[PDB]
RNA sequence: CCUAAGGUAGCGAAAUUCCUUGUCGGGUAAGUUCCGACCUGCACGAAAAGCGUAACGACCGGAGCGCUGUCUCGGCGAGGG
RNA sequence: CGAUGUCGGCUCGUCGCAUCCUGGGGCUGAAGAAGGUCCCAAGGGUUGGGCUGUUCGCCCAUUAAAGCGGCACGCGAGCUG
RNA sequence: GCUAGUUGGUGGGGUAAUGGCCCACCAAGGCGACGACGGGUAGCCGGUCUGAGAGGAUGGCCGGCCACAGGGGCACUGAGACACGGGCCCCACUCCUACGGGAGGCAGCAGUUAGGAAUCUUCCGCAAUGGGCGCAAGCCUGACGGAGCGACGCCGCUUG
RNA sequence: AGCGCCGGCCAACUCCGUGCCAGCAGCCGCGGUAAUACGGAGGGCGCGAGCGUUACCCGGAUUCACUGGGCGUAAAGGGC
RNA sequence: CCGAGGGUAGGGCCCGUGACUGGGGCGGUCGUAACAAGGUAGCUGUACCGGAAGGUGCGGCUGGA
RNA sequence: GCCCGGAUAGCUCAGUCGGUAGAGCAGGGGAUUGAAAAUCCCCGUGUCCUUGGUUCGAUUCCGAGUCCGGGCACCA
RNA sequence: AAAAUUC
């Protein structure tokens, strides 16, 4: 359940370490973003010589969340962090690896790029 | 003296010294059919050019042609979306051909607050230049974020003015706490503001950050 | 051919490089102005235009009437133009064979002094640049000089292809009649025009045909970045 | 021209700056506040002291971390009414 | 005037239409898609955050849209100060 | 100005073997303007260039020693390695994958690419010399013998 | 058969072009209408499958002086 | 146990940069300090003062009669 | 807005108490100087801010305006 | 024992 203010740990080699969510991109006034939803976010930590420098404002899709998400078959999955992956408008990663698992729900949501790049899609 | 350049027009030596100019007027051949010629020709009367003759190719009768010399700038703009939208998308042009011009060069300068802007400086026909000038300044107002004084926008060449733009300032505040209403207390706060909407003008250096994709692109 | 206008950058010059161009017309949309305008371009050169009438697979499509229209309108032999349909295995079947014959194959001595002009060029080559054209006359290959007509400036041969449709392929040298590609070190892109290629250095064809050549300033003026 | 003589050092949009969110810089995704600068000081300035100053302060500004029912946005539960 | 408690906020609204959006229209210098202008229309909806006591405004990120007035410039025996 | 395994002791551990090489206790020592400690740079010699000489400068080819084998760490086998073309693990990167998982290591000879002002043939042969295994026959040997390209250096010859 | 040079250092000189322009340059310095110094030509010197340039090392540099220098006034005696 | 390494925190040195701000070198305004007793002999350590060179005090030197 | 004061030579300024107006610097002609200053000699020059009124007559006195300068614009 | 600047 990511909302504006939420720092989420970024899981691709774009060169972002942590980003803060500044809007959840889902209508006139969506309250929360979750797995496979897209935010706008400010960049709070950049390893030196990235492409995303600090204070940049990026779009990113939520890949992992601390708040368990429920699935049609009445199972659930929560992760131990909230993670994101920085994309561009075309909705595709500027990264070239993704780190950690990602949630199956990214798949129907068309983020197929991300899903293959993953180490495990739980 | 004679002088060759420069590609980006603003620089060119002052009308104090300047008795010659060149618009590398080409003349082009357009095949067209039938008559789109009436429409077309007049179009090539605005972007002024020069007829030699040319010929009807045989039919399709709507077969036909026209060889015209027009200055490079006028040609370009005037021509493509128009060129067809005029003729209904048939017809065509090729300009190879690079002649030169003795005609008129007039370039107008665009000034914001009087702080002449170099980037917006533009180059056109004396009649067209005269025509464009209104659009530039007027198209300007949406552009320039507000600074504390009535803010001149004007467009002009060599010391006479083709255009005007004025930008409102108005950094009003002050009366917003008077309520009793001596007429004269109301005035006192605007005697300090009238000095302030002046002092700030004489030391005012003003700026516009990008958004020039907007003002003087068009 | 660059599809679209394109302003004639790839529509004509490269028009030079064909033997026959195949004219493709829908039989659903009809015949459009790009369709006709390109014709006289191509009609302009002198070539074998083999017409087509197309889509026919689409049900509603009006096929015969198109040939009819091009008929008076475009002036092509009504009978001569073929029919296929692309989505279908279609009128295709005769397409290649028809082409060869309607199309006379190329001619020039290929060991004769180099006079090579190529329709077009490879993109980027941030690393290195490649070229296409036909060395209609002559041949050039590795251990070569190249000299390209207007000022020079004289670039040696790294290789030539020739790139099989899979991609850009080998060859010892590029030879006459044959249409391929050549290298290398050009890098400048301003001097080059389609009808100017050189040349080994040590002999020069006396005159370029040509298809040339590029233009003087300025368009543009700044392409200044924001932010 | 004038005065008894015309504000020096240092400081300066300041617990003084009116015009005012002056201008430039810093921080922020965004900064009328804060910090650094400039000096057009409406109307600082030298024991009604001037410019600094380590330590101190339930003083008064600005920022960040940590953590939180302050808040999204509220819910349940205990006792006294 | 033997007393009718002030700006702004919060909370709760309700109403006008001179409509911001959404719905129906005519004209267009309406090809289409997008606009512009006037007409009908008040059913519903009209976001989060930076600065400032602010209302206002500027600015960020979005939005179908980020309407404008009235109700003692609504509302302090409802709160805040 | 530097030092707590730091400097010496003892008794162990370990190795082919001496030693704080490592561990426990014991003592308070060890080093430094004759430049410790930190920082910069560098593979070292035989040699080589210059110079009357002293000196200066340099370490390419070759020969000797050292060190490294994508960046790190670890040991196993073994006379010998903590092993370039053996093994294990982490990191970067490349490839395969049925997504569960896997394979990789040219600073060997050719060669590709990048970087650069600039730098060679995906040649030929085991005929020699040398190496390994084998009773031998032989087999392996991009060491090596030669060829190729470049005026890159020296030397020799031509254009009468 | 080519390449460097032809004011001085440094071996090799005349005409024409240019007029502080164009250009040359290691250093002196050349060029502002008779230029052996710029550009060309004739002529000449050097070296020759080469001849020049750049970069770097030693040399000239007894200019870190051990061989082999200095400090009254040139840089240099410490205020005692 | 150790352990490549990853992570947390606090320091140290270096490089790049920055609104602004010193001075420094190379190509009109104000004066005229030095070079002749340079028109007040100069220089000098120091202090204070002054648009600017500089003036003045205290003491020193001759590299001044 | 109200209150006082101002406006005179190119710049900066005196001044009448109603008749023809001054200074200082700039400017100019001369001199001195090899020359440029400094110095010396000689020289101007004004619609005394605009409008109207008083007056034989107005820079002067009277009324209004424009502009400039100083002060006030408070209790909410 | 020199009032007087500059090219
Ligand atoms: Mg945080
Ligand atoms: Mg991660
Ligand atoms: Mg930052
Ligand atoms: Mg920032
Ligand atoms: Mg009121
Ligand atoms: Mg296409
Ligand atoms: Mg169509
Ligand atoms: Mg004062
Ligand atoms: Mg001061
Ligand atoms: Mg200030
Ligand atoms: Mg401020
Ligand atoms: Mg602001
Ligand atoms: Mg401020
Ligand atoms: Mg700011
Ligand atoms: Mg800022
Ligand atoms: Mg910033
Ligand atoms: Mg910013
Ligand atoms: Mg605040
Ligand atoms: Mg400050
Ligand atoms: Mg003050
Ligand atoms: Mg005070
Ligand atoms: Mg006092
Ligand atoms: Mg203080
Ligand atoms: Mg102190
Ligand atoms: Mg303090
Ligand atoms: Mg206290
Ligand atoms: Mg609560
Ligand atoms: Mg409760
Ligand atoms: Mg209870
Ligand atoms: Mg009352
Ligand atoms: Mg009463
Ligand atoms: Mg009562
Ligand atoms: Mg009451
Ligand atoms: Mg508020
Ligand atoms: Mg209505
Ligand atoms: Mg409307
Ligand atoms: Mg409408
Ligand atoms: Mg409508
Ligand atoms: Mg349209
Ligand atoms: Mg429409
Ligand atoms: Mg409604
Ligand atoms: Mg409403
Ligand atoms: Mg808002
Ligand atoms: Mg904040
Ligand atoms: Mg405001
Ligand atoms: Mg809409
Ligand atoms: Mg309301
Ligand atoms: Mg009330
Ligand atoms: Mg009211
Ligand atoms: Mg109220
Ligand atoms: Mg109350
Ligand atoms: Mg209240
Ligand atoms: Mg009440
Ligand atoms: Mg209060
Ligand atoms: Mg209180
Ligand atoms: Mg111990
Ligand atoms: Mg002890
Ligand atoms: Mg020793
Ligand atoms: Mg090394
Ligand atoms: Mg070397
Ligand atoms: Mg060796
Ligand atoms: Mg290794
Ligand atoms: Mg390894
Ligand atoms: Mg290693
Ligand atoms: Mg063994
Ligand atoms: Mg080893
Ligand atoms: Mg190994
Ligand atoms: Mg290997
Ligand atoms: Mg190799
Ligand atoms: Mg190689
Ligand atoms: Mg390469
Ligand atoms: Mg290269
Ligand atoms: Mg070799
Ligand atoms: Mg052998
Ligand atoms: Mg053998
Ligand atoms: Mg040879
Ligand atoms: Mg020579
Ligand atoms: Mg000689
Ligand atoms: Mg020469
Ligand atoms: Mg001559
Ligand atoms: Mg010479
Ligand atoms: Mg000569
Ligand atoms: Mg030889
Ligand atoms: Mg030397
Ligand atoms: Mg000698
Ligand atoms: Mg020596
Ligand atoms: Mg010697
Ligand atoms: Mg020396
Ligand atoms: Mg000696
Ligand atoms: Mg000496
Ligand atoms: Mg002595
Ligand atoms: Mg001393
Ligand atoms: Mg001393
Ligand atoms: Mg460790
Ligand atoms: Mg560690
Ligand atoms: Mg690790
Ligand atoms: Mg700096
Ligand atoms: Mg710094
Ligand atoms: Mg003097
Ligand atoms: Mg003196
Ligand atoms: Mg003197
Ligand atoms: Mg004097
Ligand atoms: Mg003194
Ligand atoms: Mg002064
Ligand atoms: Mg004095
Ligand atoms: Mg004295
Ligand atoms: Mg005056
Ligand atoms: Mg005079
Ligand atoms: Mg005179
Ligand atoms: Mg003379
Ligand atoms: Mg009068
Ligand atoms: Mg009172
Ligand atoms: Mg009040
Ligand atoms: Mg004198
Ligand atoms: Mg002078
Ligand atoms: Mg003199």
Swiss-Prot record, chain A:
GO CC, any one term: cytosolic large ribosomal subunit
Keyword NADP in annotation: no
PROSITE patterns: RIBOSOMAL_L14 (PS00049)
InterPro entries in UniProt: Ribosomal_uL14, Ribosomal_uL14_bac-type, Ribosomal_uL14_CS, Ribosomal_uL14_sf
Listed GO MF terms: large ribosomal subunit rRNA binding; structural constituent of ribosome
SUPFAM superfamilies: Ribosomal protein L14
CDD domains associated with the record: Ribosomal_uL14 (cd00337)
Keywords, in A-Z order: Ribonucleoprotein, Ribosomal protein, RNA-binding, rRNA-binding
The keyword tRNA-binding belongs to this UniProt entry's keyword annotation: no
Disulfide bridge positions per record: none
Listed GO biological process terms: translation
HAMAP family xrefs: Ribosomal_uL14
Database matches in NCBIfam families: rplN_bact
Subunit structure: Part of the 50S ribosomal subunit. Contacts protein L19. Forms a bridge to the 30S subunit in the 70S ribosome, contacting the 16S rRNA.
Biological function: This protein binds directly to 23S ribosomal RNA.
Similarity remark: Belongs to the universal ribosomal protein uL14 family.
The protein's name: Large ribosomal subunit protein uL14
Native source species: Thermus thermophilus (strain ATCC 27634 / DSM 579 / HB8)
Lineage: Bacteria, Thermotogati, Deinococcota, Deinococci, Thermales
UniProtKB/Swiss-Prot annotation, chain C:
Binding site for GTP: 54-57
Superkingdom field: Bacteria
Entry's localization field: Cell inner membrane
Function comment: Required for accurate and efficient protein synthesis under certain stress conditions. May act as a fidelity factor of the translation reaction, by catalyzing a one-codon backward translocation of tRNAs on improperly translocated ribosomes. Back-translocation proceeds from a post-translocation (POST) complex to a pre-translocation (PRE) complex, thus giving elongation factor G a second chance to translocate the tRNAs correctly. Binds to ribosomes in a GTP-dependent manner.
Family stated for the protein in its record: Belongs to the TRAFAC class translation factor GTPase superfamily. Classic translation factor GTPase family. LepA subfamily.
Protein name per its UniProtKB record: Elongation factor 4
Protein encoded by which gene: lepA
């Amino acid at each position: 359940m990511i909302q504006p203010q939420t720092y989420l740990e970024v899981a691709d080699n774009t060169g972002a370490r942590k980003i803060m969510c500044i809007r959840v991109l889902k209508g006139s006034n969506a309250k929360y973003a979750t797995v496979g939803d897209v935010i706008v976010a400010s960049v709070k930590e950049a390893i030196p010589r990235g492409a995303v420098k600090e204070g940049d404002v990026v779009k990113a899709v939520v890949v992992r969340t601390k708040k368990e998400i429920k699935r049609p078959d009445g199972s659930a999955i929560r992760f131990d962090d909230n993670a994101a992956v920085i994309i561009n408008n075309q909705l595709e990663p500027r990264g070239t690896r993704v780190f950690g698992p990602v949630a199956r729900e990214l798949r129907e949501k068309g983020f197929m790029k991300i899903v293959s790049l993953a180490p495990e899609v739980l | 003296g004679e002088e060759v350049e420069v590609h980006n027009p603003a620089d060119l030596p002052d009308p104090t010294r300047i008795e010659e100019i060149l618009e590398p007027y080409v003349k082009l051949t357009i095949f067209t059919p039938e008559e789109y010629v009436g429409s077309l020709m007049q179009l090539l009367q605005e972007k002024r050019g020069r007829l030699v003759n040319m010929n009807y190719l045989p039919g399709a009768q709507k077969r036909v042609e026209l060889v015209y010399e027009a200055p490079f700038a006028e040609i370009l703009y005037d021509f493509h979306d128009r060129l067809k939208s005029v003729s209904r998308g048939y017809a065509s042009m090729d300009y190879e051909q690079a002649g030169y011009r003795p005609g008129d060069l007039v370039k107008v300068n665009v000034l914001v607050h009087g702080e002449v802007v170099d980037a917006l400086t533009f180059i056109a026909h004396r009649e067209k230049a005269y025509t464009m000038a209104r659009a530039i300044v007027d198209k300007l107002a949406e552009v320039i974020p507000r600074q504390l004084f009535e803010v001149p926008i004007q467009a002009a060449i060599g010391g006479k003015i083709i255009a005007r733009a004025t930008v409102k300032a108005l950094r009003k505040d002050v009366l917003a706490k008077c309520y009793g209403g001596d007429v004269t207390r109301k005035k006192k706060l605007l005697e300090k503001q009238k000095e302030g909407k002046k002092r700030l003008k004489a030391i005012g250096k003003v700026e516009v950050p990008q958004e020039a994709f907007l003002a003087v692109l068009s | 051919t660059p599809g679209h206008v394109d302003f004639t950058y790839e529509v004509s010059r490269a028009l030079a490089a064909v033997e026959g161009v195949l004219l493709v017309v829908d039989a659903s949309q009809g015949v459009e102005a790009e369709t006709l305008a390109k014709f006289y371009m191509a009609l302009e050169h002198g070539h074998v235009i083999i017409p087509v009438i197309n889509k026919i697979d689409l049900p509603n499509a009006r096929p015969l009437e198109v040939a009819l229209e091009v008929e008076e309108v475009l002036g092509l032999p009504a009978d001569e133009a073929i029919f296929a349909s692309g989505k279908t295995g279609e009128g295709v079947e005769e397409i290649l064979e028809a082409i060869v014959q309607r199309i006379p194959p190329p001619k020039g001595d290929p060991e004769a002094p180099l006079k090579a002009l190529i329709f077009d060029s490879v993109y980027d080559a941030y690393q290195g640049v490649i070229p296409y054209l036909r060395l209609f006359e002559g041949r050039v290959r590795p251990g070569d000089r190249i000299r390209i007509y207007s000022t020079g400036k004289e670039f040696t041969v790294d290789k030539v292809g020739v790139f099989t449709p899979q991609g850009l392929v080998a060859t010892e040298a590029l030879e006459a009649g044959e249409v391929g590609w050549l290298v290398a070190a050009i890098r400048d892109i301003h001097d080059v025009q389609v009808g100017d290629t050189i040349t080994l250095a040590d002999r020069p064809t006396p005159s370029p045909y040509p298809g040339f050549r590029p233009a003087k300033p300025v368009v543009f003026a700044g392409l200044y970045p924001v932010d």
